């Protein structure tokens, strides 16, 4: 829709993408620590 809503949406999208990545990093860090010695 409008300029302002497009801004809000884009920010909401970046936030959702960031939490997904953050969750992936945590899991990847655990697996590697399980792998470790």
């Amino acid at each position: 829709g409008s300029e302002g809503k497009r801004l809000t949406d884009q920010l909401r999208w970046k936030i959702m993408s960031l939490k997904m990545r953050i969750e992936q990093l945590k899991q990847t860090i655990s697996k590697l620590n399980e792998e470790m010695k």
Partner: peptide, 28 residues
């Protein structure tokens, strides 16, 4: 609203950057 969302974004970016560092540190 936008201000709140930007704040939240900044926090998650900081948290991301910590985690990437933490991944780096497991190897080294």
């Amino acid at each position: 609203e936008a201000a709140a969302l930007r704040a939240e974004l900044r926090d998650l970016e900081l948290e991301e950057a910590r985690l990437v560092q933490e991944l780096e540190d497991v190897d080294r």
